[PDB]
Coordinates of C-alpha atoms and ligand atoms in Angstrom, one line a residue:
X2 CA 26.0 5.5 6.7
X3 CA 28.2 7.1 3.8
X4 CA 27.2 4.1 2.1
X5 CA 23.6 4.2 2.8
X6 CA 24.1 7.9 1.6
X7 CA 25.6 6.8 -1.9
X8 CA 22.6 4.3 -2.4
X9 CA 20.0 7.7 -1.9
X10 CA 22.0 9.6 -4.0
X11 CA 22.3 7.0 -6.6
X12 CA 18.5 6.5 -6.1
X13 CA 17.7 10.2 -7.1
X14 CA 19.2 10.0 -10.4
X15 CA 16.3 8.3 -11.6
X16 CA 13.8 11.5 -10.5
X17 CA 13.2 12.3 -14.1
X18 CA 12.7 8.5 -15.4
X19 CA 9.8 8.2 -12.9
X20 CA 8.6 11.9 -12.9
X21 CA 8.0 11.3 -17.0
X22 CA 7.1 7.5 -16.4
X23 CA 4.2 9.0 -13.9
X24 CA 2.9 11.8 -16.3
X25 CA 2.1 9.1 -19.1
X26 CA 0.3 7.2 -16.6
X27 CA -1.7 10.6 -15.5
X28 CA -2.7 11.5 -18.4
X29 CA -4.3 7.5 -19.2
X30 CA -6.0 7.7 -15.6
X31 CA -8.1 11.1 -16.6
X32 CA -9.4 9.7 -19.8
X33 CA -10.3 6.7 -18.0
X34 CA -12.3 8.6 -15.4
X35 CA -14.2 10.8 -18.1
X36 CA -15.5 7.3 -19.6
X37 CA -16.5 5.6 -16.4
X38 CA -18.2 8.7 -15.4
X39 CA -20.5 8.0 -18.7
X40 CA -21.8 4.8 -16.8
X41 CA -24.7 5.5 -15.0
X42 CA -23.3 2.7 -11.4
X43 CA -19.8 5.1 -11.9
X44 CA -20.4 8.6 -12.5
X45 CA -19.4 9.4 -9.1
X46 CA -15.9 7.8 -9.7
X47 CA -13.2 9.9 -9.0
X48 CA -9.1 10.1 -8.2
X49 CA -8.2 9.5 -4.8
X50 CA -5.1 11.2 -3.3
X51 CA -2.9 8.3 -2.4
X52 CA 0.5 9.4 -4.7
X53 CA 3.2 11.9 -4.8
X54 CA 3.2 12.3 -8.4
X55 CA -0.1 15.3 -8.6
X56 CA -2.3 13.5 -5.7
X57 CA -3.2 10.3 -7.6
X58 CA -0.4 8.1 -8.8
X59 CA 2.0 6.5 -6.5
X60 CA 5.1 4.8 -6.6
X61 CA 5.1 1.3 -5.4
X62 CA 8.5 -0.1 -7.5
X63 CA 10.4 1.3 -10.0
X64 CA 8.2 1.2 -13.1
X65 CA 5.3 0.1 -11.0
X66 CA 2.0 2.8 -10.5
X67 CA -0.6 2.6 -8.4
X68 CA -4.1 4.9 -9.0
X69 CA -7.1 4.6 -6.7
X70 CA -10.8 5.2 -8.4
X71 CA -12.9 6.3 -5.3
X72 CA -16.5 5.9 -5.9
X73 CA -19.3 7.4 -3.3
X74 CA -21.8 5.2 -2.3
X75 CA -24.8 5.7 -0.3
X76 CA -24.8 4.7 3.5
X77 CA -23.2 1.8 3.9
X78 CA -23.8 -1.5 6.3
X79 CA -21.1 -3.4 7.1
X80 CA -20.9 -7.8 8.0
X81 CA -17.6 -8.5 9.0
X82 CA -16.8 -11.6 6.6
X83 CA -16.6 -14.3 9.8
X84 CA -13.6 -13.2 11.9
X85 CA -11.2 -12.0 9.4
X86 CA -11.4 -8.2 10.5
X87 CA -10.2 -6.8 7.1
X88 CA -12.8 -8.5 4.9
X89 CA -16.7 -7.5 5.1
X90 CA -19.9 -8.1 2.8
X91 CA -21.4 -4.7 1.8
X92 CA -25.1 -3.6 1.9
X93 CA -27.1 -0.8 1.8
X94 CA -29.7 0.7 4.3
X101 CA -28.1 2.9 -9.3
X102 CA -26.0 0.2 -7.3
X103 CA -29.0 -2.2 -7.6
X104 CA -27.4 -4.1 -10.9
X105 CA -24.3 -5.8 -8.2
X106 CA -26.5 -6.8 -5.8
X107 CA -26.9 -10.8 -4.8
X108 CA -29.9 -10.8 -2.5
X109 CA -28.9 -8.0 -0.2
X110 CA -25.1 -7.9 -0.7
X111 CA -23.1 -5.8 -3.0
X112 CA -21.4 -8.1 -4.9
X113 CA -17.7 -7.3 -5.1
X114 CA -17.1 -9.5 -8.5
X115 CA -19.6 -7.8 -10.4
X116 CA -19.0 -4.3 -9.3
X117 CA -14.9 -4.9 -10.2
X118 CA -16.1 -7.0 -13.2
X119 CA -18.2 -4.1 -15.2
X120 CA -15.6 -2.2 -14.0
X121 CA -12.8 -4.3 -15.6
X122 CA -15.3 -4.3 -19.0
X123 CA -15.2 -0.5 -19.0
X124 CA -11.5 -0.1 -18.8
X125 CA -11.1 -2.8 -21.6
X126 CA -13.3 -0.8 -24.1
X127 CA -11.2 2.2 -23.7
X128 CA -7.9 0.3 -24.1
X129 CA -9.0 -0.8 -27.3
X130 CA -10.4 2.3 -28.4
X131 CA -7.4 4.3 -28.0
X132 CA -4.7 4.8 -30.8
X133 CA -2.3 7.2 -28.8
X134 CA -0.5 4.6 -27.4
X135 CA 0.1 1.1 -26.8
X136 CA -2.0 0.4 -24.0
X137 CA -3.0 -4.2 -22.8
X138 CA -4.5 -5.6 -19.8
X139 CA -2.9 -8.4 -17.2
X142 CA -1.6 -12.2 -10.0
X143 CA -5.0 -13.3 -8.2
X144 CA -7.1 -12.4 -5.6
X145 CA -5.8 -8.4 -6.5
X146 CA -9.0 -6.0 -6.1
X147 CA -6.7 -3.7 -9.1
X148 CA -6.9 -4.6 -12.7
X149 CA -3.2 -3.5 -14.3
X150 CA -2.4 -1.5 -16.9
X151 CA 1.0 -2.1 -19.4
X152 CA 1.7 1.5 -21.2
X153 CA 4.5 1.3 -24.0
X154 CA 5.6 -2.3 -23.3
X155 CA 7.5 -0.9 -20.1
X156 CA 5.1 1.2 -17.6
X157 CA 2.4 -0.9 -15.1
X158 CA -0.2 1.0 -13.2
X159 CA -2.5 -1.1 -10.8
X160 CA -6.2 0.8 -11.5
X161 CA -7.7 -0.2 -8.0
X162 CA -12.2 0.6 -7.8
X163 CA -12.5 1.9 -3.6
X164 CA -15.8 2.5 -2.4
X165 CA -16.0 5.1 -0.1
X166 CA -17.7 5.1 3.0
X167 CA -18.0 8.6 5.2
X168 CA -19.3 6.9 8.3
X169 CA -17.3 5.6 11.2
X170 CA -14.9 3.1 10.8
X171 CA -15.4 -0.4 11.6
X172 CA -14.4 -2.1 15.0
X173 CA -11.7 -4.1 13.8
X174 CA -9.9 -0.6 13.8
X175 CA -10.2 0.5 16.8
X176 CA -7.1 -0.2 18.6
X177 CA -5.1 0.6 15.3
X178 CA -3.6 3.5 14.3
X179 CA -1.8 3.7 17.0
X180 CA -0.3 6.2 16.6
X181 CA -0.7 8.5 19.9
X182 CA 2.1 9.2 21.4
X183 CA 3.9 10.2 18.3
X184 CA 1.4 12.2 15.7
X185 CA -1.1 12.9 18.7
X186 CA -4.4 11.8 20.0
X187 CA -5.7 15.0 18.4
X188 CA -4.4 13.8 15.2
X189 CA -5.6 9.9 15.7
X190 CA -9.1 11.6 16.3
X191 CA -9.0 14.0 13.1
X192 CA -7.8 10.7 10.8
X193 CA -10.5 8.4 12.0
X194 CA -13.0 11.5 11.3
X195 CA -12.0 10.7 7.6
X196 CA -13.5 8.3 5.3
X197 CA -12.5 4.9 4.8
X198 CA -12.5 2.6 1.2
X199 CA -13.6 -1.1 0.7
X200 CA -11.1 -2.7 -2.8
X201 CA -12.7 -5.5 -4.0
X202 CA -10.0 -7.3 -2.3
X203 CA -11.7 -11.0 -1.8
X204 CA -10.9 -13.3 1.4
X205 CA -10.0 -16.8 0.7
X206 CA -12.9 -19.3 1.0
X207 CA -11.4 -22.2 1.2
X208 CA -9.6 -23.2 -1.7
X209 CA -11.2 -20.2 -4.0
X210 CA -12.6 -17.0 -3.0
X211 CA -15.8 -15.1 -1.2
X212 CA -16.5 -13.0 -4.5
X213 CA -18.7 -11.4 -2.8
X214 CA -16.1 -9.6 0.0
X215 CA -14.2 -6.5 0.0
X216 CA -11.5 -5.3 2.1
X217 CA -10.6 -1.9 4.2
X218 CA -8.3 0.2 2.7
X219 CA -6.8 3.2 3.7
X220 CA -4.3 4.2 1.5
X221 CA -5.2 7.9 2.0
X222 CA -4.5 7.7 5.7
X223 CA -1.0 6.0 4.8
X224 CA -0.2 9.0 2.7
X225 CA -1.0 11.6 5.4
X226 CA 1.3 10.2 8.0
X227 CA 4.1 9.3 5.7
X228 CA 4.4 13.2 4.2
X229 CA 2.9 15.0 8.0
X230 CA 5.4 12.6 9.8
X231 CA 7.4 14.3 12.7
X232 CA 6.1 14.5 16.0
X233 CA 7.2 18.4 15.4
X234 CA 4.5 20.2 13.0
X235 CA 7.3 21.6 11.5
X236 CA 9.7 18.5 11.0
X237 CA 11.6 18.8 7.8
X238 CA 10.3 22.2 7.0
X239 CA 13.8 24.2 8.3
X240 CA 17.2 22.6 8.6
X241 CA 17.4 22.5 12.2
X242 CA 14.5 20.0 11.8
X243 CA 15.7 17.6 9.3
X244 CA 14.7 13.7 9.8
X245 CA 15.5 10.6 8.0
X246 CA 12.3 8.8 8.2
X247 CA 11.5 9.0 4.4
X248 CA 14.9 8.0 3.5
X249 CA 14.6 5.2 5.7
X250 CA 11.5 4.2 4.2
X251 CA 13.4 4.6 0.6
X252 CA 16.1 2.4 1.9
X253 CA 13.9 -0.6 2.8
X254 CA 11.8 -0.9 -0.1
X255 CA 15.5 -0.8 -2.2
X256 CA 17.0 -3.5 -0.1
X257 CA 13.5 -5.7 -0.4
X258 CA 13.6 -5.1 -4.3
X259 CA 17.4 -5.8 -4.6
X260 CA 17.0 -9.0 -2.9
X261 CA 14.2 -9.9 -4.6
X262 CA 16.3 -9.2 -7.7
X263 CA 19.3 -11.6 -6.4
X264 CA 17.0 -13.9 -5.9
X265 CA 15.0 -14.3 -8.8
X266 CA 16.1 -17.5 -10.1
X267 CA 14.2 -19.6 -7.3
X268 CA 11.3 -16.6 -6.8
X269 CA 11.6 -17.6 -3.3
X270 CA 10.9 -13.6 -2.2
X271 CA 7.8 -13.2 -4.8
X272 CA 5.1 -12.9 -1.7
X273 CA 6.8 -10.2 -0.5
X274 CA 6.0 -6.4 -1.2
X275 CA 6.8 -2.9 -0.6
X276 CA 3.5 -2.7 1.3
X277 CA 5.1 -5.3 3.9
X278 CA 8.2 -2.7 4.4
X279 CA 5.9 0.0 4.7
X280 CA 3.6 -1.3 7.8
X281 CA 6.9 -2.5 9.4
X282 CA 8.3 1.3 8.9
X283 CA 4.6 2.5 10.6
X284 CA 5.3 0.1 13.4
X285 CA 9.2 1.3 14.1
X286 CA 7.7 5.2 13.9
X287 CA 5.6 4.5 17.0
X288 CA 7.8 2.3 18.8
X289 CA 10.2 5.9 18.4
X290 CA 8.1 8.8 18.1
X291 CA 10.3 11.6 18.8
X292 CA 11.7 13.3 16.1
X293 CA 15.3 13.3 18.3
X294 CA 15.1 9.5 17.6
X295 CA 15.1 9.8 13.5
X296 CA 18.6 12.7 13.2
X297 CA 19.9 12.7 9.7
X298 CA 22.8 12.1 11.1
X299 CA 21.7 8.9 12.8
X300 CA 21.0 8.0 9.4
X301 CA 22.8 4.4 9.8
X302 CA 21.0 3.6 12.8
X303 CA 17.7 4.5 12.2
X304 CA 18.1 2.1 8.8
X305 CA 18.9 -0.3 11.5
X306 CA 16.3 0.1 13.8
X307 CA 14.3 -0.3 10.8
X308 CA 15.6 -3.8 9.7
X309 CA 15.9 -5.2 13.1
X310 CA 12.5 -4.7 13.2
X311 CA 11.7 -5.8 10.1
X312 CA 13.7 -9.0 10.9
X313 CA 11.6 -9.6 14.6
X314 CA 8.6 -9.5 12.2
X315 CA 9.4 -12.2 9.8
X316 CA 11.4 -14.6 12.9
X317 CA 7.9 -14.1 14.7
X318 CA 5.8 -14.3 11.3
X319 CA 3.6 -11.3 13.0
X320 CA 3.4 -8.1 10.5
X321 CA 0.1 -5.9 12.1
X322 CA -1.8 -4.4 9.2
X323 CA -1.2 -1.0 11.3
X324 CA -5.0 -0.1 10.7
X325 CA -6.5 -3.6 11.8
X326 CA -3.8 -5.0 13.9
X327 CA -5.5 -8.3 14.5
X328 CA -4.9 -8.6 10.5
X329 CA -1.3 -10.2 10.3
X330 CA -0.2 -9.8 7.2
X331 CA 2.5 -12.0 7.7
X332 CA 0.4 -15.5 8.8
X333 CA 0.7 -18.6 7.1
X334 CA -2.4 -18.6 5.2
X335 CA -1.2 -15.9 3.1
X336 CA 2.7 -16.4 3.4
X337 CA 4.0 -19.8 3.5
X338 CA 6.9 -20.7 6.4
X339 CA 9.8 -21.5 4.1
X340 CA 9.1 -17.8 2.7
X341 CA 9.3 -16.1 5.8
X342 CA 12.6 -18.3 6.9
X343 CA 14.1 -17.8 3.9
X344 CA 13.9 -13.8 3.7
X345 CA 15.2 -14.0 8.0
X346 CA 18.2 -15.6 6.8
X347 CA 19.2 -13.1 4.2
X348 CA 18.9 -10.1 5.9
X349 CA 20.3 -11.5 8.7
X350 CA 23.2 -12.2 6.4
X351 CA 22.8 -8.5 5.2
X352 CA 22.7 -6.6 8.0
X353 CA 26.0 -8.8 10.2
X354 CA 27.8 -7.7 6.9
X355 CA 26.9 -4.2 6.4
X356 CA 24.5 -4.9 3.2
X357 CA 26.8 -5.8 0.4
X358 CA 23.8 -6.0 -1.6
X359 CA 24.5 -2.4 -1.4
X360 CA 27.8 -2.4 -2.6
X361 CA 29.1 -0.7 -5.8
Ligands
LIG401 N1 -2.7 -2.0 -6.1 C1 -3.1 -2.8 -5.0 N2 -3.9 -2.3 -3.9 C2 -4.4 -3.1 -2.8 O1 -5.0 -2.6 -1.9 C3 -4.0 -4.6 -2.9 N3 -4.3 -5.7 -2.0 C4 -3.7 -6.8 -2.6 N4 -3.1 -6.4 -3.7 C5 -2.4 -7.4 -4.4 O2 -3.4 -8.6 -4.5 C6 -2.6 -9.8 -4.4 C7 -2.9 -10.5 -3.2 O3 -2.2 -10.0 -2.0 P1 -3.1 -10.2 -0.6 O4 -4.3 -9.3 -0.7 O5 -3.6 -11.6 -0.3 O6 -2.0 -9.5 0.5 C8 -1.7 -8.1 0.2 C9 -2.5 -7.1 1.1 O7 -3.0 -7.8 2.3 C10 -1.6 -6.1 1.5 N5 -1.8 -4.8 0.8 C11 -1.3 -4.4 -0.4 N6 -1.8 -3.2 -0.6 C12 -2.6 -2.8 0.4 C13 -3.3 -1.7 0.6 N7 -3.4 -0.6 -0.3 N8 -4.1 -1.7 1.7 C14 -4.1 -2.7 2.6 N9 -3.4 -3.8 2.4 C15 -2.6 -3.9 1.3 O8 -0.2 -6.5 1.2 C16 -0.3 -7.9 0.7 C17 0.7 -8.0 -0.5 O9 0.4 -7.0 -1.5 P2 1.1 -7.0 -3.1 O10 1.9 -8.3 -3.2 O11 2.1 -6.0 -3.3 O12 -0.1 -7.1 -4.3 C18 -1.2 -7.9 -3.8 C19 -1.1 -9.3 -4.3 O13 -0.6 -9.3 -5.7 C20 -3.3 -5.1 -3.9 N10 -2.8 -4.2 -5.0
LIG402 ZN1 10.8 14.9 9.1

């Protein structure tokens, strides 16, 4: 616990570094919108809250930014891409120029998209500013040789949301079935996220998103409305959250001379902290002072998921984020076997 606490402390040190770090990638993001607003298929775009730096840029990794471009579209019809619950073909019931028949193609839409970003990188002499895995629906900015910002297109959709999430968000007995209802009143996204076909992709798929609903329950997060707004009402879910993104980029760090941990991300962490904050929903179960044990609950946790190669997408649970086809076994073994290792030693990747 005292050493959990250093690791925070040391942790906040760098609140300046990132707080600068996330104004340069602000103030890119707004003359990025005005541009795409130009077009005649984006002048709807706009910045969806999904950060804690303003509302629009969040923090995946040290260094690394994530912005969301929500883009209204007209009433949407959804075709659940065969049985894969998180991927769907879109189509209606300005857009036209995507369309392949009667599907909105995903590859076109992020493709002109793409092509509009590139013309104002190169048109810009403020900074130094250059384009760059697959299958991403995000096309990634470098600013000053040092700062990455995913730039991620979202169609929004304001009607219901699809049946694949319908025993997801489960999330009743600790935020509230008043709350559950209120969230799923909200719209949902489609990223131009593609499922595999085969060998290659459906470029014609997108996938749900709902990166604003994430941000809601992490920052409104107690079953207490007024959880972590006194100091008899202090939790340590956040810092528990902090603490196992650090130890996934640590070890990913140690062990970057085989790349064996490169499939995994801080969005795996995340769902597997969603997951432990329903399996203990009271706010009595996440004490400050149980600081040490709540990381634990977290990891052990963590650890079932990767021994059972089950990780829920905690929207679409029958979308397992940790299968096969998208994580290979020898991954998933390998990661058990260190924090295993890390947690019977009382993380001395921690140390120092
Ligand atoms: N900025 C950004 N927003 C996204 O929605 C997203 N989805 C994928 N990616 C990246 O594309 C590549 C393919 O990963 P895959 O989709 O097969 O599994 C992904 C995806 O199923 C899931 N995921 C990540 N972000 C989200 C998200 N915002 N919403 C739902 N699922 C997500 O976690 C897996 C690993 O994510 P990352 O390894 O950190 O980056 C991935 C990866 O580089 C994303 N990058
Ligand atoms: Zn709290």
């Amino acid at each position: 616990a005292s050493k959990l606490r250093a690791v925070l402390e040391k942790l906040k040190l760098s609140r300046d570094d990132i707080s600068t770090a996330a104004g340069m990638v602000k103030g890119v993001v707004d003359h990025l919108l005005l541009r795409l607003k130009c077009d005649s298929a984006f002048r709807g775009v706009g910045l969806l809250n999904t950060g804690s730096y303003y509302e629009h840029v969040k923090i995946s990794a040290p260094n690394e930014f994530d912005v969301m471009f929500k883009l209204e579209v007209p009433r949407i019809q959804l075709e659940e891409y065969s049985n894969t619950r998180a991927y769907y073909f879109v189509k209606f019931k300005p857009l036209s120029q995507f369309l392949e028949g009667e599907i909105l193609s995903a590859s076109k839409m992020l493709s002109k998209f793409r092509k509009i970003i590139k013309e104002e990188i190169n048109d810009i002499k403020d900074t130094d500013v250059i384009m760059k895995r697959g299958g991403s629906p995000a096309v990634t900015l470098l600013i000053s040789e040092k700062i990455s910002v995913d730039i991620t297109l979202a169609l929004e959709s304001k009607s219901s949301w699809p049946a694949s999430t319908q025993e997801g968000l489960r999330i009743q007995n600790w935020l509230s079935a008043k709350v559950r209802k209120q969230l799923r009143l909200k719209p949902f996204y489609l990223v131009p996220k593609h499922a595999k076909e085969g060998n290659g992709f459906q470029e014609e798929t997108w996938r749900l998103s709902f990166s604003h609903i994430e941000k809601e329950i992490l920052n409104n997060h107690g079953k207490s409305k007024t959880c972590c707004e006194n100091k008899e009402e202090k939790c340590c879910r956040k810092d528990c959250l902090k603490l196992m993104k650090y130890l996934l980029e640590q070890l990913k760090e140690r062990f970057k001379d085989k790349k064996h941990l490169d499939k995994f991300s801080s969005y795996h962490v995340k769902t597997a902290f969603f997951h432990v904050c329903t399996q203990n929903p009271q706010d009595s179960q996440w004490d400050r002072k149980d600081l040490g044990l709540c990381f634990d609950n977290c990891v052990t946790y963590f650890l079932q998921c990767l021994r059972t190669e089950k990780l829920e997408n905690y929207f679409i649970p029958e979308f397992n984020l940790f299968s096969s086809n998208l994580i290979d076994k020898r991954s998933k073994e390998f990661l058990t076997k260190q924090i295993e290792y890390e947690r019977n030693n009382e993380f001395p990747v921690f140390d120092e």
